[PDB]
Structure formats: structure tokens, C-alpha cells
Assembly symmetry: C5
Homo-oligomer: 205 residues x 5
Amino acid sequence: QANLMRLKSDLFNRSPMYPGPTKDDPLTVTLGFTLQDIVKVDSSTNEVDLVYYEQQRWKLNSLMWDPNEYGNITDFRTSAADIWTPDITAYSSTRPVQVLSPQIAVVTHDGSVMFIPAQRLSFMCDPTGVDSEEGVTCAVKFGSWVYSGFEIDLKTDTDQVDLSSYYASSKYEILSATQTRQVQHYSCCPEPYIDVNLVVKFRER
Amino acid sequence: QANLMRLKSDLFNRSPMYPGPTKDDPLTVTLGFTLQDIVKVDSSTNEVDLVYYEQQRWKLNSLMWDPNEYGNITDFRTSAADIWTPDITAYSSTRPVQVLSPQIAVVTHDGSVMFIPAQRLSFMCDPTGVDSEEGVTCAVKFGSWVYSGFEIDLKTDTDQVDLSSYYASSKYEILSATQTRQVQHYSCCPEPYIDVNLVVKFRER
Amino acid sequence: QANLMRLKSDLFNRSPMYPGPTKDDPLTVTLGFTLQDIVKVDSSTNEVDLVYYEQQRWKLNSLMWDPNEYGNITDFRTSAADIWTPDITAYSSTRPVQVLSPQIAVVTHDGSVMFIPAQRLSFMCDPTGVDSEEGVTCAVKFGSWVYSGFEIDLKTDTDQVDLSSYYASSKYEILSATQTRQVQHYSCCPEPYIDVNLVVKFRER
Amino acid sequence: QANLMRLKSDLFNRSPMYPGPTKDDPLTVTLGFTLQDIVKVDSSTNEVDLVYYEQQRWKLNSLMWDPNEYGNITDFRTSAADIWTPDITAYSSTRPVQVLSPQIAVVTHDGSVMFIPAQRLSFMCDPTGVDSEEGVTCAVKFGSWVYSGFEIDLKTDTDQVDLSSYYASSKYEILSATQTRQVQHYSCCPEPYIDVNLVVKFRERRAGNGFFRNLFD
Amino acid sequence: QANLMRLKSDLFNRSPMYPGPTKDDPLTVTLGFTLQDIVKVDSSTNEVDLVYYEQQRWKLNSLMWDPNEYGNITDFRTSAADIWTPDITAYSSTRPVQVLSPQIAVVTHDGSVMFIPAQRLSFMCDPTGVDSEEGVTCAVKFGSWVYSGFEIDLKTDTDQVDLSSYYASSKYEILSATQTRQVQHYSCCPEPYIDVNLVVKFRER
Ligand SMILES: c1ccc(C[N@@H+]2[C@@H]3CC[C@H]2C[C@@H](OC2c4ccccc4CCc4ccccc42)C3)cc1
Ligand SMILES: c1ccc(C[N@@H+]2[C@@H]3CC[C@H]2C[C@@H](OC2c4ccccc4CCc4ccccc42)C3)cc1
Ligand SMILES: c1ccc(C[N@H+]2[C@@H]3CC[C@H]2C[C@@H](OC2c4ccccc4CCc4ccccc42)C3)cc1
């Protein structure tokens, strides 16, 4: 505790918070989804509700430290309010996302942060054909709300959504779930736009 | 980060926050809507729920800086709690507006601020006829709650609401969507009052 | 901006907040209602839901200033958290009041404050007969929760509720809406209590 | 305003808050209910919803002052976040209690504090038989969550719930409502626990003016 | 009061808050459940709603004192916001947990803390068969969100959930309820992960 308090103080109280990325100093955030449940489908409003947890990762030189100076501590946990977090959001949600987990992050001595909020999300999706053998496919994009691809570069580690914790007795069964980086360019607008497209194909059990 | 930290410190910690406009120093705010979804209609209460995002824009001298003094940085993103924002509100909502996006704004060296809250709104609207070929029109005004036209002047860049991201598989289709600056005048008072009237004509798919 | 910053600072950072009224220094508050919609009726719980905005007004010697000393500024807007506000509450609500407008108030150089929260309120009301020509009458009292009439004197400017902004296509039409000051005693206490009685007569369109 | 500001400052800024009661310095809290409405019943979850206001009263020496030294001020209102309050809770609720009144309290020069939150509560209750001439009875215990009877002693002034503001046109009519102090035990623990047991017997409305005759309007 | 004020001040104002455990200084948290009610089942979403209370216990050298120096005080209550708490969370909820009790803990002179939040939880569970003699089983794991078993070691005192306050007129009867410590190891990483699995078998009354 002596040594950890000393590290946290040295990292957080001796200088302001990371101000976020610029064009000259971009930052790469990695995203991944572990999909736990399709809880509910509303065919009268074309809204579907997901429960998942979303792995967010990035690396900052300012959160970097030598373990030998702090009792061989190599990583620590701290409230997410003590650090910058990227403004990643679902672009087509219909309710404010609900947070299901303590808002804490893991910081590693190399400056890696790992943040994994569990969320329930309602989003835009017509579930028509969900009750066929064939199912229905729905999509939702995730990305930064105000940073372009010149400041925040998104990335995935895999295109397969982790289904190893999907609720086996869910009401809907997953036929496929992928997570794909998209880059997009619109001649109106000098900057590129990056998102991760969460595509889920599912049907009634 | 060195430079942007300095800038943010200079802009935000060396002086108080912009106190908002007065009659001698009015401010012009520009509003525009991007309509994503008519989620739901309640014919028993005459309430309709929209999901959209609202582009707010203004310019303050106090937020201005010379890029050559801050590592050629020309703009930055920062939390909306760091800056003044206009009190723009829907005048005929029936629930508190629910915010769907992270509350961050973009600030540019010329003193421009761009703030873009994504919201779900319930508002007063009689959807009788929504199931005809002919649809129903419904209207909701937006404007400052406590500033007259002598302190905040509202403006739109175009009268066409942006429908380029309207959900194709929504449950209601949009027949037309406009956004019009209006100048009201209550028979008591001299000050002008100013709103942007969102009018949506729509029908059941 | 320079002058208004100076004013606000002078008013809000040079002394503590108004502590509220006392028996020796009572404060008069004026209340008025602008009724926008009867949204909903629930005949299984006898709960009715109103959207309105409530005009609150009072005057404080400590919020008073000479315009000549502050660039001829005669009034300003500020966040309702910077000033004392009266604890005016509905006495027969069934859910916490929901606030629908930005929490900002206008302060005038004579010390007048004006505050206009928009609210949705659910409250105790039997709507049996709403479907007749003749409608049903329901009532809700507003007043300070903890201050007697010796500290806070409530007042109306008129007994008529303002219906100039009642939603034309509401599902219920208003036959009459009055707002009446009532003085009410108890044996415990020399002190009179004041409420404003909102009485709405309405029916199904 | 000068004098009150001075008083509040003296009481609140010159020392820390009351840390709460100890076994050597217990505190007695007096509870009373005013029942406004049984709003709702859900026979598919056995949850009933009450709207009431709860009168909490207690007395601290550290909140005490001589009026003569503060412009003959004998009492004042202040935000409940400025003072200690007791952790009184419903023991069998099914949702977080919702607060319907401003969180303000009244403090008196003898150190008395009075705090009266209006609340809506959902709680465990099987309303089967609510539609009979004979009604259903439901019960909910209120007490401290973490302080035993050696630290907080609960009390009621009367065992009758106040029904003088029960909603006349409610959907359910009250046949009886009481509020009784109770002293629990358990094998583990020599230390008594104290609750106030709110018991309400009610039915589905059958006449414009309720079950019991009463003279006064 | 004098002595307890002195103690709270000494424990809480003289030094920072406990920063949380580390590999070199792990902390053992004991968990136990007292189940009050299965409130509700939703067979259309496979969500069940529990009301329970969760006993949490741990011990910290920094919260330790000698009673002889503080008027023979041996323990005290204080707001959970004054001390560190573990980030114990349900792993398969479908809504944010709702807290039904005041957030206060008991601290003992030996450094033991005891914290007992009453909660309502909606969580993933298929209730098909609940209406049989035979009932249905459901399970939800609890554990730290971001601390591994090298930092937080979870324990139970007993595997039996306390049913001595289960609602006798609940709508569902409890056939069995157990709480079991589990250790899992993932191929990614060297450190073990601990959870307490709450298993409840029930049926319709
Ligand atoms: C200056 C003005 C506006 C913004 C807001 N961003 C703009 C518009 C929304 C957000 C993120 C991005 O727009 C994304 C977005 C993201 C990827 C591909 C296309 C789009 C098209 C508009 C859109 C519509 C709904 C929801 C999200 C988006 C760029 C940011 C800076
Ligand atoms: C429904 C219809 C119109 C509105 C528009 N706002 C409402 C009314 C005008 C504007 C701003 C404000 O009205 C102001 C107003 C503005 C600031 C503070 C108080 C008031 C109420 C006094 C007043 C008196 C005469 C004319 C206007 C006003 C609230 C709001 C809801
Ligand atoms: C369903 C089953 C289990 C959980 C909770 N566990 C899962 C895995 C450990 C623990 C909390 C968290 O996972 C930790 C974990 C813990 C802290 C910070 C990051 C991570 C990253 C996911 C991960 C990957 C490999 C090994 C451990 C972890 C989610 C949540 C949902």
C-alpha cells in the first residue's frame, strides 16, 4: 500500500490528466466484444437489447513507470475517473447505455490501460425473421463520437466476437457474431471515419 | 500532449468561464438536426419518441488562440463541463431528454465550439392517421429556455433536416422533415423570441 | 463578458449563499402555472400525469446591484445551483417530479429572481367520469415543505392557470384550471401554512 | 440573514459532523407514519406500493444554541446533507425507496432535529383477498440498517398510523393501519435489534368515504 | 461523540484511502448471501429478479486502532464512501443492480470491515419448468470485476445461503440455494480468477 499510494500520487497528482489525442500524436484504441445475451427483441419498435462486455485498450507514455522504483509493482487497478477514457459510443442506440460493472481500469507499467465496461444496449434492429430457421441479422457501429481517424485509430484483435460466455439458455441463439473495423471516406469531409461494426446473426432458440 | 495540456490550462484555469451572452454582447447559435429514428408512437397518450443528434455551433472570443504558440494545434476535444453551453431545450417534451452520446465538444483556434448531443426525446404529438398513405405531421420547437432573441440568436444553415442516416428499417418512414427558424413576439413584451421548429411528416412503413 | 464576470463574482464569491428566510425576515414567493398537457391517466392506480411549467419569483436584498457600476447590465441568467431556491413541492405526487428544462434562473438588478422549471408530475387523481361530457375534477397542492407562512409567504398573481400553451391535440381537453392560495393551520403551532391549490377540471377530448 | 448565517457557520463549519451514536452515547429516534395512498397492487409479483411521509425526530447536544446570541432565532431549516441522519430503512422493500419531498430538516435551539421524507415504496405483500369484504393484511418493518438497540433506540409516539391525509378517492380503503415498536434477537448476538412494524389492513374500495365513519372532514 | 470524532478524523483525515490490494499484499473478502425474495420471473426475456442482501467482510491493518486510546470504543458505523470497498459484482445481470439499503459499513478495532448491501438484481435465467413439481435451477456468479485471485481472494464461510428470512408468501418457493467458491484459470494469463457461484433451485409456490 505504501508503494502503490506513492505510484498513484506520482502518476495522478503531479500533473494534469492526459488531454486526449491530436493529429500529430494519435492514439490507437483496441476494441473487442464478449457477447453474453440477446435479452429481448421488440418487434413493435424494432429495438433489440444486448448484454455484453466491451474490452477497451490503449497505451499512454505518461502512465508509464519503472517497477523497481515502486516496490516491483507491475500493474494496478484504479477508478476510471482518475484517467482519460476514449469517448467510444454506439452510433445507433435508442436508450442511454446502462453500465453493469464497476467503473475501474487496470493500468500496466508499460502505460497500457485496460477498461472493460459491461453494458446493456438497446439499438435499432428489425427482428423480422427471428422465428425462422434462418434468423435475422442486425448491426451496430461503435466508434469515437468526436475524434476522427486522424486522432483515434480503432482496431480489433480478432474479427470473431467472443461467444465463450454467451448464455446457453438465452431466448435467442447466435448463428454468427463478428466485429469489423471500417474505414470510410466522404468527399464532403477531409478526415476519415473509423468504426467497429458489430454484426450479429441470430434466431429464436 | 505537452502543448495541448498547456493550452487547456491557459484557456480554462487562468480565467472564469464565459458567463453567457448579454444584450450588449449577443451570441448567435446554429442548430441543425440529423434524424435517426422514430422509435415509437403511443396513440393512448399522444406521445412520439425520436432519436436524433443535434449539432450546436457558436463562437467565443475568449476561446480563441494562436496555433503557432501551441505546437500548431488547430483544434481539440474537451468535456462539455469545461465550457459554457447554450440552454437549448425542446419546448413540448413529455419526459426528460435522454442523452445518447458522450458529452464532449470540439474547440477550434478561431473560438468556434461544436457540440453534438445525441438524444432520445418524447414529445407531444397526435399520431392519428399514421397508418394511412398520407401519414401525420408533428412539430416540436427548440430554443433557449431563459435567453430572449436579444441575447441568443438562433440560426439554421439549411431548412432540410439531415435524413442520410435515418434508419432504413425503422417502423415509420419519413415523408418530410424540416427545421425552421421562427420569430415569436408575446403581446406583453418588446424582446423577440426565437425557436427552431422541427416539423416531421411521417407514416407507418 | 468582463463586467458580468465581475458582477457574478461580486455577488457569488464574496459572501455565503442566502441561508433562506426566517420569522424576522420573511420572503414572499410568487407561483404561477402554465399547463401544457395532461399526458396520461391511469384508472387502475388513480394516477394522472401533468406537463407544465411553474413560474417562481422572489426578491433578495443580497442579489441587488447598481447597473452603472457594471456596464449598465440590468439582468443576467445563471445556473440555479448558484442561488438559493425555495423548496416548493407538490403535496400529493406519486413519483419524483421529473425536470424537463435547464436549471437556470434570471436575476435582475433590483434583486428579483425568476425561475421557471418545466416538470412532469404524477399525482393522486381519480379519473372516473373523464369519458363523459362533464369530465372529472382533480386537485394538487403546492407549497414549501419545511417553511411555514411566517418564513415563506406564497402568493399568486392570478387565480387562472395559463392555458395559452395547452397542447391543442392533447388527448384530454381542459374545462377549467385554477390556482388558489390557501392558508391552513394546526394546534401544535402558532404558524400558518400556505399552499397553492392547482384544481384542474378535464375530460376526454 | 446575518444572524442565521452566523449560526449555521458556527454549528457546521467550526467542528465535524456528529459521528453517530455509540453504545456509551445512544440516541433515541422517534418515528411516525402518515399514510397518503396505497397506489397499486401487483398480484403477479406480490408487491404493494405505498405513498407516505415518515416523521423522524431526535436530539443532539452538538446542535444546541442560545437564541439570545443569534438574534432570538429559535429554529431554522437546513439541507439534510448538512447534518447526520439515521439510516432508517424498510427491511422488506423490493425497489429503492423513491423520495418525493425536498431533503430539508428543521433544527431547534434545544438540539432537536425533525426530518420528514415523503416516499413511495414497493414492498413484499400478497394482496390475495384484496377484493373481498374482508381485505388483506400487509406488514413492513422499518429500522436502522447497521445500528443495534444499544446505539439507536427506536420509538413511536402512538401506535396509530395517521390517516387524516389518506387519499379519499384512492383505489384501496384502509380498515386499519398501525405502527408498533418491536425488539428482535438471534442466537449469534446479545445485542437487541429494533424496528417499527407498519401493519396495514385494506381492501378494494366499496363506498365513497371509506371503511370507518369519522366526523371531521 | 468526542472520542469517536477523534477516531474518525485520525483514521480518515490523516492519510489517504486504502488504494486496494496488490499481488504482494492480497486481501481476502468473505461473501455470503441472505435471500429474501424471488420477486418476479420473465419467461419472454429469461430474466429473474432477486431481492437479497450480501454480507461482505475484510480486514485492513490501516483501519486498526487501540480502544484504550479512544474511550474504549471497539467498533463504529460510517458511510461506505469514507472507506475502500471491493468491486464485487454479478457477472450475468441484465440491469444495473438496485441498492435497497443505506450505504454504511461497520468498522472494528481489529481492522475488520463489514458491509451488507441489500440489492435487487435482474439476471439471466430461463424459468421454463418453474410451474412443475420439479422447479428450475438458475445460477449467477459474483466476484471482483478487475482484481484477480492474486489480489482479491474470495471466500465463503458456508456454502449454504441463509433462507431464514425468505418471504413465506413469496410467489416462488426455494428448493435449494447454495453459494460456492470457484477458481478458473484462463490460457491467456498466469493468475487465477475466483467467483462465488449463487445457485438457486425454485418453483412456483
Ligand atoms: C464535429 C461535428 C460533429 C461531430 C459528431 N460526429 C460526426 C457526426 C456524429 C459524430 C460521429 C461521426 O458521425 C458518425 C458516422 C460514423 C461513421 C460513419 C458515418 C457516420 C455518419 C454520421 C453519423 C450519424 C449518426 C451517428 C453517428 C454518425 C462524425 C464531431 C465533430
Ligand atoms: C411553451 C411555449 C413557449 C415556450 C418558450 N419559452 C418560455 C416562454 C417564452 C420562452 C422563454 C420563457 O418565457 C419568458 C421568460 C423568460 C425567462 C424567464 C422567465 C420567463 C417568464 C416571463 C416571460 C414573460 C413574458 C414573455 C416571456 C417570458 C419560457 C416554452 C414552452
Ligand atoms: C462472464 C463470465 C465472467 C466474467 C468476469 N470475468 C471475466 C474474465 C475475468 C473476470 C473479469 C473480466 O476478465 C479478466 C480481465 C480482468 C481485468 C481487466 C481485464 C480483463 C480482460 C478480460 C480477461 C481476459 C483474460 C483473462 C482475464 C480477463 C471478465 C464476466 C462475464
